[PDB]
Amino acid sequence: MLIAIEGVDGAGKRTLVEKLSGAFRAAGRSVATLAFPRYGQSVAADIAAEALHGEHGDLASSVYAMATLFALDRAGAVHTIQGLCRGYDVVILDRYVASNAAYSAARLHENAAGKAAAWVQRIEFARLGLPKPDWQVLLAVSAELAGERSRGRAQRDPGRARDNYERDAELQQRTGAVYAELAAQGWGGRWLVVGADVDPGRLAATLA
Amino acid sequence: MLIAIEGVDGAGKRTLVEKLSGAFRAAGRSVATLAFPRYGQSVAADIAAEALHGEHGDLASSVYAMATLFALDRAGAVHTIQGLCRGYDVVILDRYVASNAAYSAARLHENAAGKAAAWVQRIEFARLGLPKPDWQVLLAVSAELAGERSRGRAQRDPGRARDNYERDAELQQRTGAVYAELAAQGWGGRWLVVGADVDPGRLAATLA
Numbered sequence: 227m228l229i230a231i232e233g234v235d236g237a238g239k240r241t242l243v244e245k246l247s248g249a250f251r252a253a254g255r256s257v258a259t260l261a262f263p264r265y266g267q268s269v270a271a272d273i274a275a276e277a278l279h280g281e282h283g284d285l286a287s288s289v290y291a292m293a294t295l296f297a298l299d300r301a302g303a304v305h306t307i308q309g310l311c312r313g314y315d316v317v318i319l320d321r322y323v324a325s326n327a328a329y330s331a332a333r334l335h336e337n338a339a340g341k342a343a344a345w346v347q348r349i350e351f352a353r354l355g356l357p358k359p360d361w362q363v364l365l366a367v368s369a370e371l372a373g374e375r376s377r378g379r380a381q382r383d384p385g386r387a388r389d390n391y392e393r394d395a396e397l398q399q400r401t402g403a404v405y406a407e408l409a410a411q412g413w414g415g416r417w418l419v420v421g422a423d424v425d426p427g428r429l430a431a432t433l434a
Numbered sequence: 435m436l437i438a439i440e441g442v443d444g445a446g447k448r449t450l451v452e453k454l455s456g457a458f459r460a461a462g463r464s465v466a467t468l469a470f471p472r473y474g475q476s477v478a479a480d481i482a483a484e485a486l487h488g489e490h491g492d493l494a495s496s497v498y499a500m501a502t503l504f505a506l507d508r509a510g511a512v513h514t515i516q517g518l519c520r521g522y523d524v525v526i527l528d529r530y531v532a533s534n535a536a537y538s539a540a541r542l543h544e545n546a547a548g549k550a551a552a553w554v555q556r557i558e559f560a561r562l563g564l565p566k567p568d569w570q571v572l573l574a575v576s577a578e579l580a581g582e583r584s585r586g587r588a589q590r591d592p593g594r595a596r597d598n599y600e601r602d603a604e605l606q607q608r609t610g611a612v613y614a615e616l617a618a619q620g621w622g623g624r625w626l627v628v629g630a631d632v633d634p635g636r637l638a639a640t641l642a
């Protein structure tokens with residue numbers, strides 16, 4: 227089974243991935259996790275991050291350029307993903323294709339039924355062959371709280387300064403809204419919307 | 435030996451590659467040729483071409499986004515290139531790294547000593563590890579004549595309509611000028627500037 231954890235920056239995704247992995251293992255299931263962007267393993271991913279931190283000229287100013295880099299990263303992970311699926315009972319992805327749809331639409335002030343989301347659907351799932359997730363878990367949190375967590379991380383970790391997307395409060399707000407729409411329409415597969423207080427044990431039961 | 439043939443659109447590069455390959459073979463040397471962008475073999479290359487023909491939203495509007503796609507294409511060809519070099523006496527590339535430097539600088543109205551060219555140098559040669567060519571042959575031609583050949587191709591071949599760069603006469607002119615500067619400073623390696631009347635036999639002798 228393939229599960230993707232989605233949400234805005236600072237929503238608490240990384241933590242849910244760890245608590246969820248623990249719950250699945252407590253249930254006797256083998257688990258593997260993979261996070262996107264794959265920093266260090268994908269040139270496209272590294273350039274994307276660097277662009278969001280001020281490098282590479284006008285690259286970051288293009289919504290489709292950034293989306294393409296993230297899609298190229300995932301395109302290079304197809305074999306890895308399929309490999310994990312046949313090797314473990316559960317594979318949890320920290321961000322996946324929906325991240326591209328949500329942020330791209332938000333940067334363009336479009337909704338889930340818009341152009342960017344449709345483009346991501348055509349390119350990543352159909353064209354690049356990325357498998358559709360069995361479940362997509364949206365960790366919905368207030369934009370304010372998520373932003374506070376992003377700011378806090380940067381304050382105590384010099385290696386985690388915020389990037390262009392994280393510093394854009396309005397973008398973060400719009401991204402959360404598109405995410406909610408995507409989940410409501412079951413974009414790319416079945417979704418589950420949870421809060422910060424979700425119980426990892428019951429969540430793993432629903433997913434398993 | 436690794437040779438790259440450079441020049442603006444419609445300069446006659448593809449033809450020189452064939453005549454040059456023939457000259458080398460007439461001299462008893464084994465030859466292999468590879469053309470960039472690698473359409474069909476690189477997703478990055480295909481998306482780039484599609485963007486120049488009107489697709490993928492605002493992607494083509496970013497100078498660095500386009501340069502990155504072409505660099506990612508070449509990054510995926512490193513093994514192929516090194517393989518050809520150890521398998522054949524001569525490897526001829528139809529366009530290579532300098533194409534990115536020339537067009538990127540021209541789109542930004544910069545010269546060869548500018549930011550974009552320096553960026554291409556840092557990313558493709560040093561960072562991505564693309565080997566520097568032993569020779570870079572600039573097929574210099576008048577912007578007007580080259581443009582006429584581009585228009586002619588589109589007229590007799592529905593599968594070869596011109597793209598955003600080809601329809602930009604001023605860009606083509608500026609690109610030719612940056613190419614001349616690159617050759618003058620030996621950017622990326624030794625250059626040789628030839629005209630449309632160059633003799634393939636003597637050119638192959640100079641290169642071999």
Ligand SMILES: Cc1cn([C@H]2C[C@H](O)[C@@H](COP(=O)(O)OP(=O)(O)OP(=O)(O)O)O2)c(=O)[nH]c1=O
Pocket residue numbers: 235262263275293296297321322323325326327329330386389391392
């Ligand atoms: C994977 C993916 C991410 N993104 C966005 C979400 C974020 O705003 C931004 C960065 O990806 P993040 O996964 O947030 O990574 P990061 O670079 O912020 O790293 P860290 O967690 O160590 O601080 O890119 C997309 O727009 N599309 C995608 O397909």
Ligand SMILES: Cc1cn([C@H]2C[C@H](O)[C@@H](COP(=O)(O)OP(=O)(O)OP(=O)(O)O)O2)c(=O)[nH]c1=O
Pocket residue numbers: 443470471483501504505529530531533534535537538594597599600
């Ligand atoms: C390889 C490469 C090409 N280019 C530019 C040169 C051209 O204007 C454009 C297209 O590449 P071309 O090699 O011209 O290919 P094409 O798509 O025009 O195909 P055809 O010859 O079949 O008609 O991209 C770069 O800017 N950087 C690069 O690194």
Ligand SMILES: [Mg+2]
Pocket residue numbers: 235236392
């Ligand atoms: Mg982030």
Ligand SMILES: [Mg+2]
Pocket residue numbers: 443444600
């Ligand atoms: Mg062309």
